[PDB]
């Protein structure tokens, strides 16, 4: 079986710049290689076929090169909307095989998070669990420190973070940190605080609430 | 104008069977080969079947041979994938695709989860909002199995500023996620905000109005 290998798990670029993604077949495949673009939460979309041909509707800034074993997708004039995973695929023979994908990431200027905290809803407590949600909205770069304080005690181990992919329009991240407590533990303390440290903030910002108010 | 729309994904016990369907439109279906490609949780893509335009030739990888059967009904403009002797490694999102060598159109995908666990629908709780200007609100979608859930706002009409986070697997074996949106704070008392949660494997739909 002929394999195709993408050695770059990530490639980073800025708006208006170019990025190249490599793909190596394990044996000669001629020009029978295709490229696909998969934006977050979407199915793959076809970009390149026969190594270098663009479908109708694909901008000329997308190019592909190579013959034999070494193939390259190049995106010129990169747009924020190009944030996606890019896959190569050979079809010189069955079985048809895919590369592992390369994520193209967008560098941009610093953007501080907007921070919000959400107490557990009365609905949720009725079932013995308490989720407290801290939201960090539309920030860049990805590095961000989130600290949970319950009556000034630092929490560690009882919260989980999830992050979106870079936004197709402004290239920012958003992040949720969810503190999960037993209702019994939640009712034992008053002040719930989410503290956020980030390059775009002059100093850490804290959002907080008093349970019961 | 080419569209491919899959259906049939479900939770199925290990060793069981499931048939996926793909409805084509916007092209002459009988003039193209058709294929199935799946994407595993690690996001790798695996081609799993190809059928010629007339249905006479079929091709499979060794991982699925004799367990998966691709077929088509050209009169109906439909493609099928019959899956049997299902294995844990078959869990994936399955894509209908046009052509038999490279794939110039892909469907939206339908998900198979191979599992002996029971399905459980989500519980949905408001993330209540409220200087000013911008308010944040959302829904916590908790304790469901398996993935995925789909979340929209106001039945798909509110999309600007929506962030639906990736699900996280809890120790209970159930998934949880939140979906949030930022809105003008001046509208909270007049504009209605409803998160629509669809969990197909449990046939559960939940709409929660999120109020100040």
Residues A32 and A103 in one domain: yes
A125 plus A196 within the same structural domain:
yes
Contact B166 A164 (CB under 8 A): yes
Residues from chain B contacting residue A44 (CB–CB below 8 Å):
45, 95, 103, 106
Helix (H) or strand (E) segment spanning residue B76:
none
Of A107, A138, A154, which residue constitutes the final position of a domain?
A: A107
Out of B101, B109, B165, closest to residue A96 by CB: B101
Where do the domains of chain B lie? 3-114, 123-210
Distance CA B7, CA B61 (A): 23
Resolution (A): 1.8
Q: How far apart are the first and last CA of chain A?
A: 64
Task: Identify the domain boundary among A107, A124, A156.
Answer: A107
CATH of domain B123-210: 2.60.40.10
Residues A97 and B48 sit within 8 Å (Cβ to Cβ): no
Instruction: Determine contact, residues B195/B207, Cβ cutoff 8 Å.
Output: yes
The token duo for B150 is 């789909």
Residues 86-125 of A with CB under 8 A from B: 87, 89, 91, 94-98, 100-101, 114, 116, 118-121, 123-124
Domain boundary residue, one of A84, A107, A130:
A107
Using alpha carbons, list the distances in angstroms from residue A180 to A116, A156, B127, B176: 17, 11, 15, 11
The reply to whether A13 and A91 lie within a common domain is yes
Whether residues A133 and B178 touch (CB distance < 8 A) is answered with yes
Size of the A and B interface in Cβ pairs below 8 Å: 115
Q: Are A19 and A89 contained in the same domain? A: yes
Closest CA to A47 of A14, A77, A80, A84: A84
**Of the partner residues B102, B165, B170, the one whose CB lies closest to the CB of residue A91:** B102
Q: Closest by alpha carbon to B108, among B179, B1, B11, B5?
A: B5
CB contact under 8 Å between A176 and B180, yes or no, is yes
CATH of the domain at A173: 2.60.40.10
Distance in angstroms (rounded) separating the CA atoms of residues A111 and A117? 19
Structurally, how many domains does chain A consist of? 2
Give me the domain span that covers residue A186. Answer: 114-210
Could you tell me which residues are beta bridge partners of residue A148? A194
A116/B61 touch (CB, cutoff 8 Å), yes or no = no
- Three-state SS at B46: strand
Which CATH architecture does the domain made up of B3-114 adopt? Sandwich (2.60)
Query: Helix (H, G, I), strand (E, B), or coil: what is residue B12?
Result: strand
Experimental determination approach used: X-ray
């Amino acid at each position: 079986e002929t394999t195709v290998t993408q050695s770059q798990k990530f490639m980073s670029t800025s708006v208006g710049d170019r990025v190249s993604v490599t793909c190596k077949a394990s044996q000669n495949v001629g020009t029978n290689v295709a490229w696909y673009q998969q934006k977050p939460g979407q199915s793959p979309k076809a970009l390149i076929y026969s190594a270098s041909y663009r479908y109708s509707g694909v901008p000329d800034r997308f190019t592909g090169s190579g013959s034999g074993t070494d193939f390259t997708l190049t995106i010129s004039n990169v747009q924020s909307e190009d944030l996606a995973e890019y896959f190569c695929q050979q079809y010189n023979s069955y079985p048809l095989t895919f590369g592992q994908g390369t994520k193209v990431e967008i560098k941009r200027t610093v953007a501080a998070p907007s921070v919000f905290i959400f107490p557990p809803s009365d609905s949720q407590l009725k079932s013995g669990t308490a989720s407290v949600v801290c939201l960090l909205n539309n920030f860049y770069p990805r590095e961000a420190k989130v600290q949970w304080k319950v009556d000034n005690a630092l929490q560690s181990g009882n919260s989980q973070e999830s992050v979106t992919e870079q936004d197709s329009k402004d290239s920012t991240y958003s992040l949720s940190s969810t503190l999960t407590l037993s209702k019994a533990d939640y009712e034992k303390h008053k002040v719930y605080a989410c503290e956020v440290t980030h390059q775009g903030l002059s100093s850490p910002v804290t959002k907080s609430f008093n349970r019961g108010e | 104008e080419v569209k491919l729309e899959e259906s049939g994904g479900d939770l199925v016990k290990p060793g069981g069977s499931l048939k996926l369907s793909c409805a084509a439109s916007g092209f002459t279906f009988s003039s193209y080969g058709m294929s199935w490609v799946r994407q595993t949780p690690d996001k790798r893509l695996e081609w799993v079947a190809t059928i010629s335009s007339g249905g006479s030739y079929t091709y499979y990888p060794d991982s699925v041979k004799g367990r998966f059967t691709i077929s088509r009904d050209n009169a109906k403009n439909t493609l099928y994938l019959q899956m049997s002797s299902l294995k844990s490694e078959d869990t994936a999102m399955y894509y209908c695709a046009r052509r038999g060598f490279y794939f110039d159109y892909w469907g939206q995908g339908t998900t198979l989860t191979v599992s002996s666990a029971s399905t459980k629908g989500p519980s949905v709780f408001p993330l209540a909002p409220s200087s000013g200007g911008t308010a944040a609100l959302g829904c916590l979608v908790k304790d469901y199995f398996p993935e995925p859930v789909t979340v929209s706002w106001n039945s798909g009409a509110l999309t600007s500023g929506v962030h639906t986070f990736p699900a996280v697997l809890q120790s209970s074996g159930l998934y949880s996620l939140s979906s949030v949106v930022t809105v003008p704070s001046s509208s909270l008392g007049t504009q209605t905000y409803i998160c629509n949660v669809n969990h197909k494997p449990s046939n559960t739909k939940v709409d929660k109005k999120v109020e100040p």
